[PDB]
Each structure stands twice: as C-alpha cells, then as structure tokens.
DNA sequence: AATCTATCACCGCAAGGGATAAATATCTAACACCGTGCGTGTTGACTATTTTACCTCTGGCGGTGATAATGGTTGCATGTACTAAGGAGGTTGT
C-alpha cells in the first residue's frame, strides 16, 4: 500500500529590456546542502532522489 | 525537433523551464483506505505483527 | 527592433526610468551610499595587494577617486616606470585567476 | 526501622572467545628537483578607449486625409422561494 505519483513542478525568464533572465545556483549562507544536485543552469538531474 | 521545438511563450516571456517528480507516497498512519463494499476510513496505527 | 514596441508597450515591467534612472536625480546618497560601500571593498583589496600593482588597478572609469585620473597625479605616486600604469587594470585576469580573489567583493549587487 | 529465611536466581569463580597491538611489510604521498610555458617586464606601433568636433542616422511626435460614404446596434440579468415594501385607484367607509 505504498503508492507511486508523478508530479510537476516549473520556473519562467522574462522579456527583458535585453530579453533574457538569470537562472543559476547562489544562495550562499541559507541552506548548502539544499544546493548540491544541479546543472550548470541551475536544475535537478535526472535519476537523482530530492526531498 | 520537437523537443527542439519552439513555441511563443508571449509578449512577457523569452524562456519557460520545467522538473517532473516520482514522488513515493509510502504507506503511513492518517493516509486513507477502504474494500469494495463501502467501507472507508483511515489507516489508525501501524501493529506489530503480533499487536494484532 | 520589433520587440522594441512588445517588451514594454502591453502593459509595462518595472523599468524605473527606463535604465536611464541609474543616472538621473536619483544619484544622489538614495543610491551612491552602495558606491561609498563598493569602493571600500575595492580600496580594502587593492591596498593589501603588491606595492608597486597596488595603484594602476584603480584608473580610467571612476573606480577610486572623485577625479579618477589619467598618468600626471598617479605616475608621481607610483614613481620608477611608465603605463604599467594601466596594464595591471587587466593583468588581473591570469595571475589573480585564483577565484578567491573577490571572496570580500561581491556584495554590492546585494546592498 | 530494625530482624531474617527462604525465594528466584547472581554470583561463584571455571572456562574460552575476541581483541588489539606489536612487528612486520606493504602501500602512497609529500616533496625536491627539473622543465616547461605563461602572463614576468618595458618598450613600441598599432588602431580604433575616449573625447570633441563635424556632417548628416534614428526616431521623437505632431499633424490630420475628401468622386463619396449621413435610422444604429445589442442579445440574453431571469425563470426559483420566499415576502416586505411601495405603488396604483376606485370606493365604502373614517
């Protein structure tokens, strides 16, 4: 009686004067370990347990 | 290429980004069950194999 | 050139004063107070470095002085040689490669 | 709060298991050397850092067209259940 779900969860960069937005990994000093699993643009592998 | 693919995302909105979760909602107290004929409720405690 | 018009003509983002505002009236202590701030760090670091370096890597654009000069005022401060004057404003980039180098620069993005 | 006999058993006290630390032998790492090549230095010529000047982009916004065009669009507020109030006006009464 364990069950099994998928769900989704999603992020957005603006028009811009330019035309992009930022999207990386700085938080410093508010949570390190919550940092550790992600891509050069900031995002979660997959394959990898996140909680 | 349709995973490269683009689309407008409107006037606001150069780029979107997504993740997808398999969430493993384990068993656990306060979580519901019930059978076929109409008995339904939640699950009260977990018991020992012998606490029952 | 056409989004131009469609990045600010449907219903406007917070573009203060378009980016103009960085230089209008709101230059006054309401912003320059993170200048006297940015320029402390910057003072700090290039003052613990080389004797000699340690002037050059301050020149041209406004980064230490209220008149930020050219050779004249800052030559007879540095004495010996020439425009290693303004080389090391760049020279930084090889040397000082360990990335460590801003660990007490960074904050003024954030203040 | 002292006394003990008489429980269910811990002690009474034999055995033996694992441990760890000694000595040996292996591993690696820390270093000191060397060599490479890069970011050590001034000088010099380049060309296009910035400024100002000039000649002549981009985009500020103000201005308003004429063969003539001269009765318009607009769809669903709501169908129920109540009942309190104001509105009507003729009249049989106050």
Known sequence: ?51 | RKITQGDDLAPGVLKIVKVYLAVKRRIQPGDKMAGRHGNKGVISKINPIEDM | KIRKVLKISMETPIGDDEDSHLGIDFIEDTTSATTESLRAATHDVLAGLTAREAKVLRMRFGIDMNTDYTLEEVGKQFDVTRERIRQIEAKALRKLRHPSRSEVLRSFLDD
Do not use: M, W
């Open chain 1, 1 to 51: 009686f364990t069950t099994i779900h998928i769900q989704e969860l999603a992020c957005v960069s603006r028009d811009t004067k330019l035309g992009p937005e930022e999207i990386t990994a700085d938080i410093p000093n508010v949570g390190e370990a919550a940092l550790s699993k992600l891509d050069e643009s900031g995002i979660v592998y997959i394959g990898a347990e996140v909680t």
